Amino acid sequence: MVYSYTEKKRIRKDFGKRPQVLDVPYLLSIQLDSFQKFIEQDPEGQYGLEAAFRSVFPIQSYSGNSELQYVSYRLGEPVFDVQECQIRGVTYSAPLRVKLRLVIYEREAPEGTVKDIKEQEVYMGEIPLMTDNGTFVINGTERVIVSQLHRSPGVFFDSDKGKTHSSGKVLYNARIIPYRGSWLDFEFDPKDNLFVRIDRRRKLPATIILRALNYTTEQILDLFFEKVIFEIRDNKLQMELVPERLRGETASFDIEANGKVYVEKGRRITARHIRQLEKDDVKLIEVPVEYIAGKVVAKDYIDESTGELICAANMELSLDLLAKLSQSGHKRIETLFTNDLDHGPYISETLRVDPTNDRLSALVEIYRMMRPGEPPTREAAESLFENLFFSEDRYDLSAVGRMKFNRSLLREEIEGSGILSKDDIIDVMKKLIDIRNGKGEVDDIDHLGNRRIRSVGEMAENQFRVGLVRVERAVKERLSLGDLDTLMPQDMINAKPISAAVKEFFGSSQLSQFMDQNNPLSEITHKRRISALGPGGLTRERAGFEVRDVHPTHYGRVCPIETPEGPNIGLINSLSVYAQTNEYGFLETPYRKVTDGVVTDEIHYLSAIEEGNYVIAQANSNLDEEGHFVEDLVTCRSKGESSLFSRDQVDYMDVSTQQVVSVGASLIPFLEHDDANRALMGANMQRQAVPTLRADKPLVGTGMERAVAVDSGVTAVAKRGGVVQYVDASRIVIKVNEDEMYPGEAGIDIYNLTKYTRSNQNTCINQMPCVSLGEPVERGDVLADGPSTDLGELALGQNMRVAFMPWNGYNFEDSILVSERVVQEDRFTTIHIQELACVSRDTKLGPEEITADIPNVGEAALSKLDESGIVYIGAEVTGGDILVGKVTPKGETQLTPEEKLLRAIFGEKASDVKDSSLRVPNGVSGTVIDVQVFTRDGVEKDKRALEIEEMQLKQAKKDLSEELQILEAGLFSRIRAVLVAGGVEAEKLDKLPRDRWLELGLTDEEKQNQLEQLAEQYDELKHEFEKKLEAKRRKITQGDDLAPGVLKIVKVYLAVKRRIQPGDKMAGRHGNKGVISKINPIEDMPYDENGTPVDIVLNPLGVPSRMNIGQILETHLGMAAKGIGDKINAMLKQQQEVAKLREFIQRAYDLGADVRQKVDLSTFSDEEVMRLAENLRKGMPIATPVFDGAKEAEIKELLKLGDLPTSGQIRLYDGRTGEQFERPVTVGYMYMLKLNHLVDDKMHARSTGSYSLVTQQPLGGKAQFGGQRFGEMEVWALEAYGAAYTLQEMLTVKSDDVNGRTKMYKNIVDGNHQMEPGMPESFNVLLKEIRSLGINIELED
Amino acid sequence: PVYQGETTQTLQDYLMWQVELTPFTDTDRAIATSIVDAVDDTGYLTIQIEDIVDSIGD
Amino acid sequence: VPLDGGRFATSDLNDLYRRVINRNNRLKRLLDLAAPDIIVRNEKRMLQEAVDALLDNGRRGRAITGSNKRPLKSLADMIKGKQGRFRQNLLGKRVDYSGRSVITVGPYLRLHQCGLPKKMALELFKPFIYGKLELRGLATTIKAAKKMVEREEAVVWDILDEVIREHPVLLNRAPTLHRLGIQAFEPVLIEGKAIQLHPLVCAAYNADFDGDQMAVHVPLTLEAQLEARALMMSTNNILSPANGEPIIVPSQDVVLGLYYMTRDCVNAKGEGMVLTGPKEAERLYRSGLASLHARVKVRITEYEKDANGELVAKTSLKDTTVGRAILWMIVPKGLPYSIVNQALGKKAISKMLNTCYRILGLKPTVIFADQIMYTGFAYAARSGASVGIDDMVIPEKKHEIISEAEAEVAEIQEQFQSGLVTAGERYNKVIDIWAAANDRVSKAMMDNLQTETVINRDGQEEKQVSFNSIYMMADSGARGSAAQIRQLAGMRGLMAKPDGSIIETPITANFREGLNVLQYFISTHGARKGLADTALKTANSGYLTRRLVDVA
Amino acid sequence: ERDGLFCARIFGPVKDYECLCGKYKRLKHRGVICEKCGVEVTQTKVRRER
């Protein structure tokens, strides 16, 4: 039945034509699921922090009899919590301490240890801990490190079709990229020449790398080429014949198979003769002599008597050699096949181009080629070649490369070494040659099986390993020099490089960026994005075009909808709602198991490759009562191409209809009724939904809005939900029941709300409570509602009554007409808490003290300041006024009489300081919420900090008091329960506890003992609380750690408030965007017989050109919901009976097909029905799935239910003339979302400001006063007009010329309106820059 | 790079700025700069008035 | 590069300088001590390399910085490339009088006006207001005028209105391919923070009213104002400089209004009667006649220019409708009556304005254009066109056509499995069959979305043109086309998205019903390809324009 | 610093009409070279033209 009593207030009418089997996951366990293994203690050193130590920590000195052993590590407790780290401005990290061991061995004795120093733990830097949901705290901010998509390490075979020489050929190449080390490639030439290009170097020669591995010429010839048979005795030339290999088009002559000739000379080839020759036993048959000239020798042969160098390897045989190989005695000279069809001579064709033939002369050529400046000395030629990609310390693949290597070569074993071997390259080249010949298929680049996502879990590990391998060198160099000496373990292990690397990775990187706090959806979308940019993958952003495209394997692993429309389109992707990371790093997707025609409730997570082997059905297929199919031929996918199959060949089936949809694109109603472009742009604009004052519920509904809101990590939940006792605007206490609590605790939980706290985009983060007083709350229920939330669900915008009609050309193309009743009703009003801050910057001449009595300033302007010089919180600071007075101590002079006289005249002003306070930026206004102040510990100041100090302390004082308060009662209660029938009265003990009157003859036995026992406990508690808060005080007044010069800062938080205006840009979920055009009064708006004028007017010209029937359906559903809500409101206002209301609600809920059941009067106690009806009296919310929403018939039925025209259109009147429109116009309440780009945040103009020192040009960006670049596209427009004079006045006079702009200003102020060209400064700068070289240039006459 | 060293005013250029706007003749403008350039930034002028007459060269 | 104060962090331009300086100093100091030949040779080689890298660090230099591996800025890279001195000395420098405000719409303006916010003013025409206050005596000095402007009193707004009375201004948009991207306008003060814009000139700037940032430049000198008034003024360039055709032609809303106000019916309210001609407007605001009343006789005065361009009047009592009769008053005298007695689509008013500019002149053409825009906005507001779920209807024979097509595909695949048809032949035959089915569905859609509105009469059936909003906004030419409407009722088609490969089974759904997940997923590839192509073609077009302009 | 980059005695002075020395710090002396430090007191604008 129904549950979640908190959600049971406003029940959403979901349709759900398809049932649900798999519950929606946490939807935000990717960053935290991968970062957890980085700190969790693993039983074996496989992954995480153990894999960073067990890998390269046990380093050994250079024969110094020293060893470094690792026992275990531990992470200390953080100094501050998540709250204080963002307030103060310090990072949130935990200290790392590890116990090491220094094993020293005595010389001249094997395995002889004298002592060990494994009794001290060393601290190696602080690792940045992770917050409750995926986020991190760095320098008071909140950053996110997006996971990066990388091709899995392994062997890849590219094609490069029609891009070699424009001749129509292809060069099948091969590449092998490891996880850490150097690369290796095998390129192919149109002239059948192989390359050994390494690390994108020059084109290397033929396969000499195999010759450098002790493999001689004959070994490679026997390996890559096979010798079938050869025999010659007394000029017989008899050889065995194989039908599969020795074939071709025709035969020259002399073809007899044991007597009777099967294939005559000069006859066509027949398969029947080949079959008859293969069936019958055929021995070695005679062959002509002309075939000897064509075939090439395989191995090296020499004469028996003479041992000269005749008959070398890789040399075609000739007739002149025949005699000289006939008398030598070589009867068996093995040869090659040399078949252009299958077994090509490509290997032999490249061996003849090798400059060297011996391994020694071969291994020295690659050394001078990889390194430009290096002489062959027989010293590094072997070591560098062995340490390049054959050493463990310089080459590794983390077993992922090994798995992909074993999988691409049809190997069964999955375990191997990180380094490469000879047989590995042998098999790689063999498969490459086979693919070139036509054995095998070309691998796919953009296939997801080859791609994998890397989160912080396997990136912070790499960063820590890189930071530790640097200190490893210092440890090695220190253990060698001065080893025989007793020292501390922390002798040379300084965690400077490790800390620097961790800081460079987390703080400022290419993947670590500020999160989008515009809305709860923005952050949950940004945490689930996937990018291909960063330190790896492709080369740059201008990489290719076929990579940034959708693939058939992108069905249920990424989102093809959510993607930007900028220069990085396609590269950015979004994870699906059911996507999940694999153990190796791949992407998996769930599917139900379908056996013997029935569907089993069990699910399996298939990967990208495994999905290609089975047959996967669709979620939109009908299902019988017994799990059977209605239609025999169901649409299913087999190998990418979907088609109809029988009910017996189906293997798997999808889970839901939103499996191909992400977390943000699933919040679009009627997605299938929208174009792929409009839905895309609507989901993109949905990320930037700016919140408002009161979030309005999405009456239309799209699905798991409650789930998205509760998983976005923006609201507060109630863990161990019991009973609520005290509610407040910033504090909520909850008394947990006896069942859901453990002993040793008071049994209360406290939640401190977050009220008006800044975000990464100056968006206020406010929270609101939900329970009033003494309401039972279950576990996991939402207690507090944050920004853009309403009763636990997500609400990005507001419901608004729209009407698609032209209105005096104000909605001409895409402008949205807005009534005046929308500004009056405080709708779409946003708060903006921007906050600047003035430093101290203590000099060396004096300490500029922030005072409250500066010079050159009236008393009226200093009437807003404090006694210590700091703007009172609550003041309505506007324009440009003093915010934080601060005078810099200027170096005072000496005697100079005038000063002496002047000084006496006034005092403490003349020759004292140089006024320079904060001053609110020219263009900022609004009340100042609160001011924070950080001071360097040890400085005798704390003027206004004391006030703040008390406040903070006070809050904590009561915070831990309540818990203790309750404890006290129990103690007395126990004493009062122990004093029962012990000669004690009621009022006597009530008047004053006093430890039960010091056990005044309660029982004269255990009574006193109990009392004593209780006394101790009571006293213990007192001391406990004392020290409990004792530490708290210390931390609060522990001081702040700033920089060097800075003395004491004081950040002030301003707080504006904007209503809407004709320059604001709003949009919807469907993609229909636009700016306002006019704010017309209420009366001008259209209306009808009843009234209620529309608030928003839209343009219907977009619907035909842009397929957005989804918004029409949304409008109709909103109209029906509002009609039902108005009927309910009327029934509540007429004070009707509860039975009629309950019947009406049940009838409005139970309408539709057998898709969902919901009935009242079975769980509600006649009191929750009125509560439910009060929450939706302004309209009840609906819910329609992504690809399983309501149908037109159901919408028309819901419209007819609400006592209104079934069509949806209605005859509207005119609010200006007063007549009626002949054509009916569609009305309803749709959902609108406010955007971030406004007009009061970008509009700026100027005429004269400050210009740069270079070429004397103004600024371009939004500085105090900046201009706009006048590009070439603008002057090209002017040259075709005749604006030569305008161009002349815009190029020099008002841009570059220094005296020119001043003279122009003078002439305009005087009223002359003339121009003097002169000469710009940019040309002079150019001449000065050209004269800096050996080039002469000067102006002549 | 960063050769955008924004410039400023402060009673030397600002003082000179006003000079142009007002109607001062060639002989007067010339003289104006002499006295507007002897104005110490701290507060008042440096040299005496008679100095200024001698540094006109008349 | 003045930093916080701790380290200056110079612009890495004097670093090469100090390197060369100290290298030459140590070389000259070593030369005086008679060093060995090898040492002095290596030192002079290092000096040569340092001097060669100082001029340019892009030839065997590979210079790095102290912070990261960034190339050191030489004296040759700051004079070339995209960012450099030759792109800061040419038209690449920022200019004052910026603008930068969101563009909105305005139906009360004319062809040579623009809504300028009062807040954007008082900062642009600042030296002008200063001079005005100085001449009016209300400003004794310059500091006084500056103080009065800073306080923003009542008098400075009147002074600004007086100054900006007849001072031309010019507008510019960031993407400006053709010369029409920069025009001039007469600024008009409007309360607000957004810049209004004429609906007809919008097509000139190629905007869609999703307002981006704009630019507003102010001519200071007299000759610049003269050039902006005589050459850059919008009332001077009406035709396109590429083909000599008018571009100020009305847009969707005006087209829709003019098409709705010009439409004949069968049995209207009070048809048949004879009208004077200027009386049709009276019965429009009352109930004695409909705008769509056909078979109505009303005389009109047609002026011709036969005798040496002299206006000769002629009356013939032509039969027309109430709407066309009312529109005729807007039509000037120098035009015949056979230009408005029609359907009046998009091309109709275009060629009407073309003929008007050809015959009657520029000023009367501009007058006719603004009046046409006014009356089109008015009739489009009075009409009340809306799009609903009932405004589109799926053909009833569509399911039968789909069943026949799938039966034909089944027969084709059966013949293929029998061994008579190969793979490629069967594939092409299935493609052709699906194309024929799509064509037949598209043809049957027009049977219901066109001339399918029967009205009761003496014959009970007349089969006049339909009055569906989807069809009236399409056929007129306002917005959309028949191919886009086809996807609304019929089938989308084959949609060969992946690498152009056609799929055997095409999408048989429409944007009104509920599409399948797989069909939407397949269709998504085409949009991803299209968006990428549109994002990529812009750079190529810009490079082509740059090269062509630089060459010619 | 003396005889270096941005130094005195070349590239114009660091101020309007005064050398780094500290004499002739006014318009009274315009085209004379100070004996203490040989820095011209011509103008500050001349620094970008030397």
Author numbering:
A (entry chain C): 1 to 1341
B (entry chain M): 110 to 167
C (entry chain D): 253 to 804
D (entry chain D): 52 to 101
Wording from the paper:
In contrast, σ54 recognizes conserved promoter sequences at −24 and −12 (13–16) and forms stable RPcs that are then fully dependent on specialized activator proteins for transcription.
Structural models were obtained on the basis of RPc1 and RPc2 reconstructions, while the reconstructions from RPi were insufficient to build detailed models. The structures are similar except in their relative orientations to RNAP and the degrees of distortions of DNA around −11, suggesting the existence of a range of conformations in RPc with varying DNA orientations. Notably, promoter DNA consensus sequences interact extensively with σ54, via ELH-HTH and the RpoN domain as well as RI. In the RPc structure, we could observe density for σ54 RI-H1 (residues 15 to 28) with P17 N-capping the RI-H1, causing a sharp turn away from RNAP and into the DNA double helix. This raises the possibility that σ54 RI N-terminal peptide (residues 1 to 14), although unable to be resolved, probably due to flexibility, could have threaded through the DNA to the opposite side of the DNA from RNAP. Here, we show in σ54-dependent transcription that the nucleation of transcription bubble occurs in RPc, due to the interactions between DNA and σ54, although activator binding further promotes/stabilizes the −12/−11 DNA distortion. This DNA melting nucleation event involves base flipping and subsequent capture by σ54 residues (tip of RI-H1) at −12 position.
